[PDB]
Amino acid sequence: GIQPTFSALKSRTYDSYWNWARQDVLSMYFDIIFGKLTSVDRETINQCIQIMNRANPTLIKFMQYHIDHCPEYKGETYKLAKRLGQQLIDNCKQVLTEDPVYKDVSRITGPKTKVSAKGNIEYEETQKDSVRKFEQYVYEMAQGG
Amino acid sequence: EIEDKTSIIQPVSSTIPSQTIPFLHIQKKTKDGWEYNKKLSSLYLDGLESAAINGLTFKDKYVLVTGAGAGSIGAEILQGLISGGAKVIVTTSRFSKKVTEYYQNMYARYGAAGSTLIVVPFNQGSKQDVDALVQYIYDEPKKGGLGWDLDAIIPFAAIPENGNGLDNIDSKSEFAHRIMLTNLLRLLGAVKSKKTTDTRPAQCILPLSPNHGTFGFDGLYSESKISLETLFNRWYSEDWGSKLTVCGAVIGWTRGTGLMSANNIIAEGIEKLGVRTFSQKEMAFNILGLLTPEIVQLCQEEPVMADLNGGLQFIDNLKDFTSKLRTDLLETADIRRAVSIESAIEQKVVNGDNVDANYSKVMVEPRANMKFDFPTLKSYDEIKQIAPELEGMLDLENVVVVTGFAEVGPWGNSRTRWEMEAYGEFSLEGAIEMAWIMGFIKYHNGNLKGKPYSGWVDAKTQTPIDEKDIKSKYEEEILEHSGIRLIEPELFNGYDPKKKQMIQEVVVQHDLEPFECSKETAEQYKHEHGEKCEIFEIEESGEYTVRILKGATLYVPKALRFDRLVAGQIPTGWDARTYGIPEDTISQVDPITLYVLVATVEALLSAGITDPYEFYKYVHVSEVGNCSGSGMGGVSALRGMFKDRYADKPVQNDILQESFINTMSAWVNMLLLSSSGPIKTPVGACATAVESVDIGIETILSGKAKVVLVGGYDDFQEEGSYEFANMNATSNSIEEFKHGRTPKEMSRPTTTTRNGFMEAQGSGIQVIMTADLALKMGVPIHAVLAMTATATDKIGRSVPAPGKGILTTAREHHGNLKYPSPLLNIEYRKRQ
Amino acid sequence: YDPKKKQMIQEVVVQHDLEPFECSKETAEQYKHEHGEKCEIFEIEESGEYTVRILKGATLYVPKALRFDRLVAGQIPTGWDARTYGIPEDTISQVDPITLYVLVATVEALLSAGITDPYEFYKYVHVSEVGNCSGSGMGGVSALRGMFKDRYADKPVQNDILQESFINTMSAWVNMLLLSSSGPIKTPVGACATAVESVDIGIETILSGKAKVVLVGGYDDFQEEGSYEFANMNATSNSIEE
Amino acid sequence: AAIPENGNGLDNIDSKSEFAHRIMLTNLLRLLGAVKSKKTTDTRPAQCILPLSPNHGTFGFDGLYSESKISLETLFNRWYSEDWGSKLTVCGAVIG
Amino acid sequence: QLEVLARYLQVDLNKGAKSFIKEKEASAVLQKELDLWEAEHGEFYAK
Amino acid sequence: VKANLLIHVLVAQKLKKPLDAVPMTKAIKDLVNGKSTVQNEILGDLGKEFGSTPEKPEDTPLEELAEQFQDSFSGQLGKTSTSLIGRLMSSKMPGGF
Amino acid sequence: TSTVANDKNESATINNMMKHLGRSEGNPVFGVFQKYLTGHPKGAAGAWMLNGAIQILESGLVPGNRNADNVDKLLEQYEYVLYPSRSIQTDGIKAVSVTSFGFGQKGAQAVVVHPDYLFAVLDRSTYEEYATKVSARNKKTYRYM
Amino acid sequence: GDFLRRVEERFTSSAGTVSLLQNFNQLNEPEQFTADFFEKFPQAGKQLISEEDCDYFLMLAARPGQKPVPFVPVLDERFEFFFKK
Secondary structure, three states: OOOOOOOHHHOEEEOOHHHHHHHHHHHHHHHHHOOOOOOOOOHHHHHHHHHHOOOOHHHHHHHHHHHHOOOHHHOOHHHHHHHHHHHHHHHHHHHOOOOOEEOOOOOOEOOEEEEOOOOOEEEEOOEOOOOOOHHHHHHHHHOOO | OOOOOOOOOOOHHHOOOOOOOOOOEEEEEEOOEEEEOHHHHHHHHHHHHHHHHOOEEOOOOEEEEEOOOOOOHHHHOHHHHHOOOOEEEEEEOOOOHHHHHHHHHHHHHHOOOOOEEEEEEOOOOOHHHHHHHHHHHOOOOOOOOOOOOOOEEEEOOOOOOOOOOOOOOOHHHHHHHHHHHHOOHHHHHHHHHHOOOOOOOEEEEEEEOOOOOOOOOOOOHHHHHHHHHHHOOHHHHOOOOOOEEEEEEEEOOEEOOOOOOOOHHHHHHHHHHOOOOEEHHHHHHHHHHHHOHHHHHHHOOOOEEEEEOOOHHHOOOHHHHHHHHHHHHHHHHHHHHHHHHHHHHHHHHHHOOOOHHHOOOOEOOOOOOOOOOOOOOOOHHHHHHHOOOOOOOOOHHHOEEEEEEEEEEOOEOHHHHHHHHHOOOOOOOOHHHHHHHOOOEEEEEEEEOOEEEEEEEEOOOOOEOOOOHHHHHHHHHHHHOOEEEEOOOOOOOOOOHHHEEEEEEEEOOOOOOOEEEOHHHHHHHHHHHHHHEEEEEOOOOOOEEEEEOOOOEEEEEEEEOOOOOEEEEOOOOOOOOOOOOOHHHHHHOOHHHHHHHHHHHHHHHHHOOOOHHHOOOOOOHHHEEEOOOOOOOOHHHHHHHHHHOOOOOOOOOOHHHOOOOOOHHHHHHHHHHOOOOOEOOOOOOOOOOOHHHHHHHHHHHOOOOOEEEEEEEEOOOHHHHHHHHHOOOEOOOHHHHHOOOOHHHOOOOOEOOOOOEOEEOEEEEEEEEEHHHHHHHOOOOOOEEEEEEEEOOOOOOOOOOOOOHHHHHOOOOOOOOOOOOHHHOHHHHHHO | OOHHHEEEEEEEEOOOOOOOEEEOHHHHHHHHHHHHHHEEEEEOOOOOOEEEEEOOOOEEEEEEEEOOOOOOOOOOOOOOOOOOOOOOHHHHHHOOHHHHHHHHHHHHHHHHHOOOOHHHOOOOOOHHHEEEOOOOOOOOHHHHHHHHHHOOOOOOOOOOHHHOOOOOOHHHHHHHHHHOOOOOEOOOOOOOOOOOHHHHHHHHHHHOOOOOEEEOOOOOOOOHHHHHHHHHOOOOOOOOOO | OOOOOOOOOOOOOOHHHHHHHHHHHHOOHHHHHHHHHHOOOOOOOEEEEEEEOOOOOOOOOOOOHHHHHHHHHHHOOHHHHOOOOOOEEEEEEEOO | OHHHHHHHOOOOOOHHHHHHHHHHOHHHHHHHHHHHHHHHHOHHHHO | OOHHHHHHHHHHHHHOOOHHHOOOOOOHHHHHOOOHHHHHHHHHHHHHHOOOOOOOOOOOOOHHHHHHOOOOOOOOOHHHHHHHHHHHHHHOOOOOO | OOOOOHHHHHHHHHHHHHHHOOOOOOOOEEOOOOHHHHOEOHHHHHHHHHHHHHHHHHHOEEOOOOOOOOEOHHHOOOOOEEOOOOOEEOOOOOEEEEEEEEOOOEEEEEEEEOHHHOOOOOOHHHHHHHHHHHHHHHHHHHHHO | OOOHHHHHHHHOOOOOOEOOOOOHHHHHOHHHHHHHHOOOOOOOOOOOOOOOOHHHHHHHHOOOOOOOOOOOOOOOOOHHHHHOO
């Protein structure tokens, strides 16, 4: 176990957020028009934040072309991506010149252990009914239990 | 919901009931020990309310995070550091391709602007690594380091140890105690000595435990965690009070994967007491809230205990309590099992074993559905919504279209390259096609061990195999022996890249003893060594002895460990037997033309041309061209006339006629087409198969051909690989292994750390064709070649160095945009 | 190259071991890797260079020669020199001999067109319209002898010999040293009849409008290993029976 | 048994401190863990007398001394949780 | 004359010398493993 | 028992000729000579002894016999070999043997 | 082709020809980089790219350079080009550029337009007669293959 | 039925679906069964017989212990065995 594995020649710096902003905009853009993410879903809000955490001035010029030339006549999810895109274009202009933020929007999940009538033990970490954000989770943390 | 700084008006400090300790409380030390302080704990939670409704900033924060494996707490704080803008060193004790592509995906989604993530190999049970990694974080970029200065440290790394009791404290427990404690302190003690500035503290985040020996058999785990609590008092007593500020987190019940999957079944049970457990994204949230700028200032005056244990210290005998909840759910699960097992068989006894076979359903095994699938033709009223009023404008006799195409690549053909390209995974249809081309499965027909059989049978044992057992038995081996991998000596006539054979000219200084040889060879030695050898006839046999004398030149063999050990092979087991090339043409012809014949049929097949003579029903024989060509092709036959002939190895007599670049297009004509159309042959090095299109299109639009093949092909050999090494074009494979790169990832376009390309072999052919003759034959029009070009760059003295002469495909005149040009408008040309 | 004394090597298995000869550090490690057990190496501690003994059973390559048939070929005239046309001794010492024959031929073909300087086209035409659709049949045989025959002996060879082995690289030195154009580069390679298809690729380059000036050519070189392999195909006539 | 170590700070945890941590802790537990395996009788307990310290890092520069002494306090809770409750009974002394 | 008598009697004149240099790199291997202990742990712990 | 040694044995007793008199290269049809009840009985015996009989066993020679007891004729003496043995032994073999 | 000199020269050429022709600002082309997967088959390079360009045309998919560890920082100045590392299904690809740079100052460029822009210059009678012989040849090539 | 056991097996993919043909006694009224079977597989009515399912069909028609088939599927080595038989 003590055999030393460090070497400076093997470090892997990861930098190019300017690419992954211009990727994950248009990666989100076809998850909307092909219905793989609706506006009710919570991972589209997770990855609208991670785009405006990576906002550059040219990323808006990237987004604004794809929302101006999105064809609304092709469907109703094509209505969705122009509306949900332009709402993000208006947000990336504001968070521009501000400091990128960690806002976790994951839906709070708790444990539920149920035993099947055959006798199998299955663990479903289901969504909490009364605690649905970290806004409500911290309110749970103040109450004790 | 999408429509950012929401103000808070009633904080969580006012939400805490009296007499009630929160689930997450900061402690403060008094003389009696540690106990709950409401002032510090309300300042904690009001930051976490703002960290939830507004969020956290981590810009210009330099963190070290150790123990950050995929699916831990230490990887859910890395999503929360990097999303805030932190600059994190990440440690992996296992360094691989699947390890760092986890971290690349984690940066490609969460990498906020300003953030960097660095994955280093690091052992923490090594003293020599913890000395050398803080020398990599603090030293300057001119000495190889990073030039950072750490503003937080999170040393979470540990060993999974279990079953080590007190009588069995073993060597895995002495190595876990060194990882978790006696070299964690050396990690904090080395960031101290590299700091020179008392204005930059480094907030240590220590994963304390609330369970110090209250469980059972874990080894030195509790002795590793309880002695991290003495860094609270040692902050006062030693000289690092401004260098390292300690902020110990007490992580409660975290519900995660790994070895705690046997403990998730009772997290529901102890939550019924009024206690709470945590998922990993929650103890992500709970430790990242120890990095708020109000806690950060509080850690700089006080050592901070943050007891994030969610009420679990208010449970008497937690070991015996969670033991009975785990027993009772296991003792309920088996009595409900063993009853339903016995009641199942008791119904088999009464109702009979003939009936219960009719209770199970007949499931359907799936097969592969290899189709051919020409591209899906849209309907004509649909085709004019995609393209508006373009009807009747282009003359179809002057539009070139690709009507078929194929390859012989490192990933098989055009179908199984696209599955590895578009998806990274083979289908079921594409895994019996890589098993077909690599020669794993052979289609048996007839009798197999008595019984009649018609299906896929292995080639090594020859036993029947279902089509879903093609992936499950061979996806490990199809992937291991295809694509960019290290050069296998069986594919290149004994070329071992580690033992590249060379000869050294040695002048003999003491004469060899005589060896017997034949008549003409002894006359060949005496002519070509001259005085410096002797020959003498054996009159009993007629063959001569020859003695090499002092001063004659010998050639002594040698070898050298050569650099380039990886290249992109045609898949190991690819064979031209399996396509139907006769063993006549196999034994004559150079290996690259085998790759061109294979590629030419299944490119015609991609055009619906089952027989190459089906063109001549529509076109004349003098109008089927072949404007294909190679870059260097024939390297195996250039090795025959230059390297193999000089040794007088037994070589084919007409090897020079397969060395040519226009002779692979001969075997296409000699064995398939029998045409009289325009043969040409391009040879523009790398970019030769795009000028092959260029020579292809103007061949068609001039009217000299109506069908013409268009292609490119080249082969990998020993002497071709060594000479790209000395031009420093292909990347040194050995220095890729000091960088920890596997062969499937050292072919790196666009990259910051790209080092040269990866050389490969094979072919590629397209059957291009006029647009109207394509729709008069009924072939699949796959593409429309609108443009093609070639261009020569600028005066230079460096041939491998590229240039920009092809930028003049976009040349136009913008001196006067006052008048828009009339001729670009589609309705102007239509009325003209 | 003496055609009467064409040098070949014969692989001879040694049956009685040679006596030790002294060599350098890495070469002795190269012998022991590539002969294996069948040789010994020993360090001289006084000098740091090693002795190596070749043992019984190792393979040597003994040189030989043979009186070869084809003694007559149609030489560029004896004393022809690319010094006398103005090619610098920079490009002489780098480049394979055939591109010397192409540079010489390209200027005095432009001179036959009244083009005293290759940049006189660009007064009339754009730079992206001066092509070079010339090409060779096998050209670069002197640099294919470098990477295949001269490299295996570890003779001192130019490092970038492979980039002059190409057939599209003689048209590079026309562009690198004369034209500095951006027109359609192509390269035909149809064996014997390659300079008439070079016209063919040349004309439809012009009539398509892709070039207005384009060079059109053919060139090839005579060497030892190219001559021996036309002998075994029985294409060139046996000079002795002539 | 212990090693005299002094002047070993946190930046100078050295090899005399890794050898003192092995003497005082990670091989003291192997000493109590080996008298367990040689016992076969649950009627004879062996009273462990552990030299605990009341000064866990409240002094200065002593090396891994306080980390050796504070983790002998986890043998109190481990008596309940493991199978040596009748083999070794722990009686920790806190010497002033 | 010494080589041709050693050739006759099948006596290897360097069998001792070949086994000398083959154990000298074998004892260099265990030295390369032995100092990995002392570089990791240190001189006081190892003594 | 092997297919080659199986067919020969049964055929040897059917044709009442020495075991060498019947070359396994040829076919029963040409070996019998033309008898309608000769070839029919020959195949019949083997048919009930094995079960696996091809379309044209009368023409199947050499390989045919080997294929018959190939991915099948596993080591079983069958009824043909059993009946013959039991009968012959109790009709010729000494009393009690 | 994974070298220091090529991937900025190839990137500056696509940037400067898309700059000169009047792309909208914020419409990068998606760079696909097949040589990570297939290697550089030096003579055969442009064919594997032209096979890939047609496969991209029919599916509408855009593959990813799945060894883009970190795209070079010097490539952020090339705004009219995008560098994916993740396979992304688009709703339709009209034309694909295929550029190949060779030794000896040998550059090249193809443009591969989708087949449907050919199938709208011909009237209703010719297309529905065309689609029959394709469906005839597809079943006949099916039986052969 | 044992031919239709190949048709579900051919046109389903990676699934482990239960069969539409659980018992061969469902084939006692085929014309309403075959239509309901081939509405689950519309692509079976348009894709030709595969060659792996073509020599399978010939291996069903000449299987031992079966009634000989009332038609001829191939002109081959086995024609009279298909014909007079």
